[PDB]
Symmetry: D2
Subunit: 346 residues, 4 copies
């Protein structure tokens, strides 16, 4: 019969700790911590990949089309964000190691680095970090540090469909964008154009003041932004610059879901969007906590490379965050009368 | 040169995941989570054992006598409590698994259980959980479930000196208890006896009242407690009953440190005492969070056994917690005379 | 315009700290911490009541009948559990206060206690802690400590519909229980009866294993069939060992088993959140007890230790549905025919 | 006798919630959360100020000279770190509010802002954030937004001695720096110079290239003028002597007299870290709520211009082999 230690293959897991300081005849106690910490990180990366790959497959193989599967999708994404939340907290363990003490074994580590985490890279890639959007380290590609089946895996990760791509595809199919249907984008442009007109009238009416002057300038700004939403070419341009990532139609789908999130069919889809943003947030918080530690340990340069990874260029779903820019009054939102509610009702 | 994956023997760590559901031709997704969670726990237990064993050795080998080593001792104990804090939070990850989903692979796990965690047992033992006071599960001894070098290791863990025993030894050597020296115990008994007398007079003077009675009743209770501290035989009795764990002299040492904690030589010792209590607390919080989950997963015998492990019967440093019972007014505390104070400097 | 400090009425919030040790001419530093900690707890209790009362209203006014409201309901319940998670962590702040230091101002507190938190009680009540099932303190009822409008509010809180009651009501209306419809309960009894038989046949196929298998089977059979004894339920209900109506229990199990069906996805989330709130409330109680121990020693401790029991778990029924888990293949197949109803 | 609600003045605390959305006849549910969150933050800031001011006083009144007070000092600093850790987690509560929902009451807030947290500013100042090194928002001074007793308090907070200043003073008095005593700085320069030479005596090019880099850094430690210059720029904060005291404590931390002082240094760095983490978590949220200047201004607060104890972090840069560290034989350890 099956025993715990065997079920968990602890013969492997708990015989994987080799202090290099010890191997070279100068055992340093805190090296053990350094080893375990990373090994735990790698376990959890493996788990995250497990969840993420599973969700990619649900999209890739069209199961997501069957909306019964949305609960599973959101659960696993949420689980990823829970794991990441932990991985952030896990830095607290390694903060128990002083720089002075780390200094006593750092030499036996050269020339190895976290940079060589295949899994971390797989994770970046599978979520949808693009190579053109990557900061080079020492003017080199991240993959040039990897060889063999490893380089092969990393390629597959780059070449196979990312979560971003798969979500984009799914977002494009969001119900309500059909011009022959609810014509969301049309109704939205109209309602915003109308609404803005109304507002300008209001402001013009205001008695010549400095508040008014301010309100006028504000209006100009908002009007610009709000209408920029309907400039597909602006989008295509911002896409090429990598300031956006999602297709124009995917963006429409996402905003559809934002605005109509209470409608039954969009309740769990809205949760998914939230979770995708959570993953981006937590990944960046991981990067920041990593930076903050490397600083404490090595001083001021990897530090600056790392500091550069704490940017929106590494946020895959930055588009979802930026939909907050285009928030309008609720009353401007195209009406979902019972008439046109049925298509979003399950 | 050295590569990350090799340094961390990831060839082992990341090839230790064997879904039994998959091995029996019915892969269940959430099983992977269950495996990784446990594997992470076991990594961290290993680290805790590493820290704990190191601190045990510092005591057993008299390095703790050189007070330079106190910083190291407290840091590592604190590190243990930081890890435990994390392990408690780690349950949040496994709470992402529904009971319904766990039910879909629980069959392939029989007859294995967490009970078979050698390391968890080693940890209990090395801290100082006593078998005499271990709740039996289904009329079984915990060790009877283990065989081979495992059973051997568990025995060694039981027989070799525990942290409690080693701390006890060290506490017995606490400066200030010397009757021919500061005579803390003597001065304390005197000051308490005197103080209590004084209070009684205060109350006796009061006029008969329900208040007076309420006060007299309280005084009797306090007097009882405070004086029970000087009944060595009561202690020896409670020791045999396992309601206390520390020698009478170790108890004196601990209270010495509590009362004079601001004195330089006692500052880090007091920190150590705090950390020992923290470890007990977090260990029991681990047990409670484990229970809370087994309930959500299996419903309500195991559950009840587990609920019973969340008791003071498992609290190794219960004596340190209970020194709060014997708090006296500050002014009752034997004054540290300038000459005397010298013995607590470095 | 509006100023931050005024918007937040900080003239009140940040002039509410009066050290009693200082008022009596012996200021103790750590008293300040003790005050702030509690004040923060109370702020968050107020917020929890705000969320909880809002959700109660959505149920009581029948808005929950319109399923567009489910996202809001689950978000606010989830928000409650997030606040509670914080309130648990908040104990870590007060653990920075030593018992020795607390001892230096404890006297100036008498005879006040956390016990007198009106809000904590309102929260217990509004979730659905029953007075009859409350552990007595000092051989007396919790409310005897309260007077005036406070006692009045506490009564209202006890008498007005609890979250449990309102969820019960809603669970009773769960689709699928209709005997004329999917007849879940019927199909379930049948499928379990059948499934158990099939297992016995497997088992009937002598060994140590066999001995074990049959013992397991016996209990499982007992448990699973006990589910269909409405009388046992009504009995356990009167004993307060269960809380939900038998019909509500059917609704809940319906949702468990068919949770992936779109209409049940967010409802299942709600059930999970209700259990989370119970769990976190218990974790708060445990962390409270653990601290009172470190501070006062060894007995309110014992009273408190008694509050960490199933007597205080309002949705214990939802936790215990794990007992009645069956193989997936036993679950009545959700008719593609009528699937559209769900 | 005393009642809980009265002891805690809950008549004030629990009657301080005024939804502006409600005051203007359009109550929005999530506004309540926004209010409470901030109120909780402010309570905890008050507590932090209480701890911090107490520690400042222990330094300023010379009690820290009596080393029995070090336990109290480190406990309270650690307590600050624990509160800050909580305040970081507290953002998770407000993350339960969607941008869509926040949008429904944001209007009733104009023109109010977190910027106007007197306490947050008092906290920045009392720790030792320098005004000249503060990034302007909208080409404006932070204090310009405050008037009355508030502006007065903020000034006092700027003018009275900061934690940094008080720690600096104390670090300068670290035992061991006496040239006539252990003569740490000399022993250090000597041992380093010697060891570096030996290394030179000993890919090879890259190693030599690295050695040159190393040597540069290590020797830069003894350039008092470089330091004084970097000090005036505000790229460093501590006096040259305080820096020596700190490094003394780093290297000899195991020595009993330095055990708790080393803990203090660690905690000062922890407070810097946690303050920055607060700033970052605030940013990461304003982004999800407002989208996009504020975000970027805030991203600028995650600069080391806001790290008061940056000197303590950077002592990791000047790390030598242990065997280079001047030996503390008990005779000269007697202290
Ligand atoms: C003492 C603690 C640590 C130090 C000093 C440290 C140092 C560094 C440095 C300097 C780099 C930049 C590449 C290089 O120059 O070698 C780096 C990158 C990295 N580290 Fe760490 N690290 C630490 C802990 C960790 C931990 C716990 C993880 C967990 C897996 C980790 C994972 C990584 C990863 C994945 C990268 C590449 C990041 C990217 O390219 O965006 N490191 N680390
Ligand atoms: C699905 C999650 C879990 C379930 C259902 C579960 C179930 C159980 C049960 C029923 C027991 C009591 C003994 C028995 O009946 O075999 C037990 C004990 C134990 N479990 Fe778990 N467990 C879970 C997760 C974990 C995790 C994450 C750990 C991490 C190491 C763990 C470690 C243990 C240990 C060490 C014991 C023995 C405790 C003692 O004897 O004091 N379990 N578990
Ligand atoms: C020094 C810290 C604390 C001590 C010593 C303490 C002590 C006690 C004691 C002894 C009781 C039992 C009733 C009594 O005998 O007076 C109690 C109950 C209670 N305490 Fe605390 N407490 C502490 C912190 C807190 C905090 C931070 C809260 C936050 C609100 C709190 C809330 C309560 C509540 C609500 C009760 C009633 C609980 C129930 O009946 O189930 N206490 N406390
Ligand atoms: C909906 C949530 C929040 C939003 C949208 C928000 C927005 C902003 C913005 C845009 C700024 C930049 C200054 C300005 O434009 O007025 C700011 C600054 C600030 N916020 Fe917030 N904030 C939020 C929550 C909080 C919370 C919970 C705190 C906690 C008290 C807080 C404290 C501050 C502080 C202290 C500043 C000034 C920071 C500095 O100057 O470094 N905010 N906030
Ligand atoms: C396993 C092994 C090593 C690491 C590191 C890591 C990375 C860089 C390190 C280091 C540890 N100790 N010193 N350095 C020097 C920094 N150099 C190295 C590369 N060239 C320029 C920067 C992090 N995680 C690990 C896991
Ligand atoms: C690895 C493997 C298994 C586990 C468990 C665990 C423990 C008990 C379990 C279980 C999983 N699934 N069903 N049970 C039945 C409980 N019974 C068994 C003994 N007789 C009464 C209770 C926890 N962690 C694990 C790690
Ligand atoms: C505000 C004020 C006080 C509290 C307490 C609290 C409650 C009871 C306490 C206490 C603190 N310190 N000692 N006790 C004594 C416990 N018993 C003794 C026997 N008679 C009844 C009281 C918790 N939160 C508070 C907030
Ligand atoms: C109480 C009241 C408001 C706040 C904010 C806060 C600050 C600025 C906000 C906001 C909320 N919502 N929108 N803005 C606009 C940002 N503008 C203002 C200045 N001009 C450029 C940026 C945070 N905490 C609060 C507490
Ligand atoms: C049938 C569909 N699930 C349509 C779809 C796409 N994105 C959505 C978001 C919310 C609701 C529905 C959708 C599909 O084609 O996947
Ligand atoms: C020399 C000594 N380390 C003395 C000692 C024992 N316990 C203590 C507690 C606090 C301070 C000192 C001690 C020893 O005998 O180990
Ligand atoms: C229309 C309805 N909301 C039906 C209902 C009740 N409970 C449920 C649980 C899950 C799904 C639907 C329901 C009502 O009658 O309120
Ligand atoms: C006597 C002294 N406490 C000297 C002092 C300053 N910093 C220190 C650090 C560690 C040890 C001692 C000191 C004082 O003058 O305050």
């Amino acid at each position: 019969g099956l025993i715990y230690g065997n079920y968990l293959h602890l013969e492997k897991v708990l015989n994987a700790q080799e202090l290099q300081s010890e191997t070279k005849g100068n055992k340093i106690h805190d090296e053990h911590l350094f080893i375990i910490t990373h090994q735990a990180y790698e376990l959890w990366f493996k788990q995250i990949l497990w969840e993420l790959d599973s969700v990619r497959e649900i999209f890739q193989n069209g199961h997501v089309r069957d909306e019964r599967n949305m609960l599973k999708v959101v659960s696993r994404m949420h689980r990823v964000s829970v794991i990441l939340k932990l991985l952030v907290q896990q830095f607290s363990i390694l903060e128990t190691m002083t720089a002075l003490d780390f200094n006593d074994f750092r030499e036996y580590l050269s020339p190895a680095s976290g940079f060589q985490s295949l899994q971390f890279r797989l994770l970046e890639n599978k979520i949808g970090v693009l190579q053109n959007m990557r900061v080079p380290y020492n003017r080199r590609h991240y993959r040039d540090n990897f060889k063999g089946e490893e380089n092969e895996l990393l390629l597959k990760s780059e070449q196979e469909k990312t979560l971003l791509e798969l979500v984009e595809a799914w977002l494009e199919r969001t119900p309500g964008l059909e011009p022959h249907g609810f014509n969301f984008w049309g109704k939205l442009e109209k309602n915003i154009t109308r609404g803005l007109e109304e507002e300008f009238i209001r402001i013009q009416a205001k008695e010549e003041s400095e508040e008014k002057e301010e309100q006028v300038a504000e209006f100009q700004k908002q009007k610009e932004v709000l209408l920029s939403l309907f400039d597909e070419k602006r989008h295509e341009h911002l896409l090429s610059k990598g300031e956006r990532r999602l297709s124009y139609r995917a963006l429409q789908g996402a905003l559809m879901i934002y605005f109509y999130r209470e409608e039954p069919r969009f309740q769990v889809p809205f949760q998914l969007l939230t979770s995708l943003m959570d993953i981006d947030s937590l990944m960046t918080k991981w990067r920041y906590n990593h930076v903050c530690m490397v600083h404490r340990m090595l001083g001021s340069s990897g530090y600056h490379y790392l500091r550069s990874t704490v940017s929106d260029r590494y946020k895959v779903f930055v588009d979802l965050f930026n939909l907050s820019t285009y928030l309008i009054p609720r009353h401007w939102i195209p009406k979902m009368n019972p008439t046109i509610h049925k298509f979003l009702e399950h």
